[PDB]
Structures are given as C-alpha cells and as structure tokens.
RNA sequence: AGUUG
C-alpha cells in the first residue's frame, strides 16, 4: 500500500506481460502521475524492461520529471534538462516525437514497455502512434498501458475529483471588454482561463493588466520561459492554450473555459480542400479535462469552474482522423506487418488499409514536407503522392484560379529564389497555412524556396 | 487553429 503522496510499493506483474494492452481510467487528481507512473517505472526497472515513456506535451513531459526525478530515465524533450549516461533503458519523450522517429526511417528501440499518458490525446501524430503500439502489443512483442482519465467513449464533461467543483455557466468573452463582466476581475483567488488562439490568448491578457492584475501566458512559444513562472511565483491569472489541458497542477482556484475551438475539417464536397472551421465546441473530453486542472486539492473545496455551451461529441469531419491513417500507412513493424489503428479509434473514417501507403522515393518527400517545410500532414501527402519533389515548389503556382490566395483583400505575389514574380496559387489548398497572417509568412517563405 | 521535433 502507500500514504497520501508516495507511489506503492505493490504493483501488478499482470500490466508487464507481452500481448497485454491495459487501459488505467483513473479520474482526474487521482494520482497517475505522482504516485502509479513512478511504481510502475522502478518496477519495470527492476524488472529491466526497455521501457518507453510517451507525454502529450512539454506541459504533461514536465509533470513527469518532478515524479520521476531522481531515476534514470532518459529524456528526449525540450522540456527537461537531464544528465544522461546513455545506458538507461527508459526513453521519455512526446507522443510526437515517438511518431516521427517512426516515420523519419532512422530505427527506434525494440521497447518491451509502453506506457502512453493521456491516451485520449486527438493528435494525428499520437492516433497514430496508438495504432503502432497497439499492433506490437497484438503481435506479442511488447506490453503498452494506456493512461488517460478520457478515455474512448468518455463523454462525461465533470467526472469525479479530490475536492468538490462549483460548475457555473456565465458567458464569457472571446475579446477585449471594458464593463459587464464584473465577475471576472473581482474574484480574489487564482484563475486558469482557456483561450482558443495565442491572439485571443494575448487581446484578453493585456486586458486582464489593465485591472492591475498579474498575468502569465502560456503557449507553445512561451512555455520554456513562462511555465516554470507558474509554479514559483504568485500569480492572478493564467491564460493558456490547451497546452495545459492535460496535466498541468497549477493550483489555482478557477477554471474559465469557453468550450470553443477551430479545426481542421477535409472537405470532400467538391475538389478535396482543407478548411478551419469553427469556432465550435470541444470534445466531452476536453471540457473534462480543463475543468481537471482545479478541484485537485483535497483540503481546498471552493474551487470553481465557470465554461460556456454544451461539448460536441461529433469529431468525424475533423481532419485528424484521416491524417493520422495517413501517418500510420507509413510506418512498419520490423516484421513487415502494417499498423492498423488503435481498436476503439477504427472507422472513425472511411479508409482502407494500406490506402496512404506511399512508395519509397515518396515516402521520404512527405516526412521531409511536414518536417523541413512545416506543412501540414495533409498537405504533405497530396504534395509528395503527386510525386513532386520536396524542393519542387512549381505545385504553389500552378493551382486554378480559385486557389489563388488573398492577403488583405489583395492578390499574393511571391518573388522567388531565383527571382521571378509569380503568383501565390497552390495546386491544393489547406487553410492552416494561409488562415493565421505569420502561418501565410511561413507559406510565402516556403514557396519562395527559403524552406 | 492547436501541438510536437
């Protein structure tokens, strides 16, 4: 058994045998990362199992490191400073990288432990990575556990917690505000505020100011810098992506969350394009797992959670879903045998085995595209199965007339590397490179050819 | 749009 606080010093053999896939459905605050992640690294230690430790983000990656510190893990994120010898037989790393050093042909370890947190994650990078460690599972060469307190089929938005949660739907801003929402300001206790975009994260933040308030923000550019400030420090107000939606103890008091995000959606209706639609509504997942981020502290029963709207459990049309057999067709078991996806994540979308799967001299190009060039994975694979080289940017110009972009009301011209004046037009079009204005400066560099 | 290298 184990105290409040210390990891158990018994842990099931059943969840270390080859062809055992466990899913630990733990509710939010009941301690899958500081007490059963570290019992079940020293036993697999022990019981020296090459064992590979998979995080959604840096934010779930430094979670870890305060549970585990001190074992000899070695860690492969931007999130963590470690010593490493280089014999440990624990890799920790994002659902992400894992993905793309499958991907990226280089070979990866034959790990006989996988333990995935937040298994739930939509990443098409991490659906896909489930479909591989789920196939070495079946196969019998590995042991994987999934932990996630959402797990598939999970629709419930206020699951179980430590302490009691005041769930409390008001309105809330998307924009600046200057009166009517007296509500927000005048509370005195800490606040986690879960915004859709980094400029809707930072037109709200430097508002919040305004009332004297103290307000860190947090985002993939920001985090190495501003993460550690939430922890050591006393703060108002913690405006985030949902970079913090898994994990994160910020030990605050109150969660707003608005519920509402864009995304990714193909569009089968007429030539095939990729949209940002929305804003919408998250998942029952997500929702539940903002309001995790409070009510964690037992000796603390005044936390509140104040959101907006109902969750939409319908995510079919969305993007990730066909991206992530996308990522899948292209990775192999050294058997030869194809992954195919994670069960509870099969038919999410019509697709057919092997349909992504792409040939040698293709296959390279399009992990090049999403790497070298940033491009989305959809873009990529219609960019590289046309079998265009990835240095080949004549495919950016050579589009219809419709797919011509505008910027500011105005015909994008892009003066290229050897110095002609062409217009911007891409033979297929995906919005998250021309939606946000620096996502379009990224795009108008690429096709440039200084990517 | 987010996220990961």
Redesign the pocket.
């Known amino acids: 058994g184990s105290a409040m606080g210390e990891p158990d010093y018994e842990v099931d053999e059943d969840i270390f045998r080859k062809k055992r896939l466990t899913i630990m459905d733990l509710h939010p605050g009941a301690g899958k990362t500081k007490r059963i992640l570290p019992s079940i690294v020293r036993e697999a230690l022990k019981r020296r199992l090459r064992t590979l430790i998979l995080?959604?983000?840096?934010?779930?990656?430094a979670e870890m490191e305060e549970a585990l510190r001190g074992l000899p893990i070695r860690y492969?994120?931007?999130?963590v400073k470690s010593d490493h010898t280089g014999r440990e037989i624990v890799d920790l790393?994002?659902?992400?990288?894992?993905?793309?050093?499958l991907l990226?042909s280089t070979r990866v370890p034959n790990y006989n432990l996988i333990v995935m947190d937040e298994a739930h994650?939509?990443?098409?990078?991490?659906v896909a990575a489930r479909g591989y460690i789920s196939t070495r599972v079946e196969m019998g060469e590995a042991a994987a556990i999934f932990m996630t307190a959402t797990p598939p089929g999970s629709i419930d938005p206020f699951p179980q917690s430590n302490s009691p949660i005041e769930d409390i739907e008001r309105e809330i801003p998307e924009r600046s505000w200057n009166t009517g929402f007296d509500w927000i300001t005048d509370y005195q206790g800490k606040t986690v505020w879960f915004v859709?975009?980094?400029?809707?994260?930072n037109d709200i933040a430097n508002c919040l100011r305004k009332s004297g308030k103290r307000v860190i923000q947090?985002?993939?550019?920001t985090?190495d810098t501003e993460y550690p400030k939430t922890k050591l420090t006393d703060w108002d107000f913690v405006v985030?992506?949902?970079?913090?939606?898994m994990g994160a103890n910020f030990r605050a008091g109150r969660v707003i969350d608005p519920r509402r995000?864009?995304?990714?959606v193909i569009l089968t209706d007429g030539p095939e394009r990729v949209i940002?639609a929305?804003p919408i509504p998250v998942t029952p997942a997500s929702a539940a797992q903002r309001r995790g981020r409070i009510g964690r502290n037992p000796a603390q029963e005044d936390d509140q959670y104040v959101f907006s709207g109902d969750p939409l459990k319908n995510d079919e049309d969305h993007?990730?879903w066909t991206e992530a057999k996308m990522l899948l067709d292209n990775i192999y078991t050294p058997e030869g045998i194809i992954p195919t996806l994670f069960g509870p994540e099969r038919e999410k979308t019509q697709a057919i085995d092997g349909e992504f799967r792409l040939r040698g001299e293709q296959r390279k190009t399009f992990v090049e595209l999403?790497?070298?060039g940033?491009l989305?994975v959809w873009l990529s694979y219609k960019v590289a199965s046309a079998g265009i080289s990835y240095k080949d940017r004549e495919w950016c110009f050579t589009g219809e007339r419709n797919n011509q972009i505008l910027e500011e009301n105005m015909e994008v011209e892009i003066w290229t590397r050897e110095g002609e004046k062409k217009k911007l037009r891409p033979k297929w079009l995906d919005?998250?490179v021309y939606?946000?204005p620096?996502?379009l400066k990224d795009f108008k560099e690429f096709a440039s050819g200084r990517k």
């Open positions: 995080a959604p983000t840096r934010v779930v990656a492969q994120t931007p999130a790393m994002c659902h992400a990288t894992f993905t793309t050093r990226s994650f939509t990443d098409p990078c991490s859709p975009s980094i400029k809707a994260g947090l985002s993939r550019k985090f985030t992506t949902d970079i913090s939606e995000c864009l995304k990714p940002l929305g993007a990730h999403m790497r070298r940033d989305p919005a998250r939606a946000d620096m996502a």
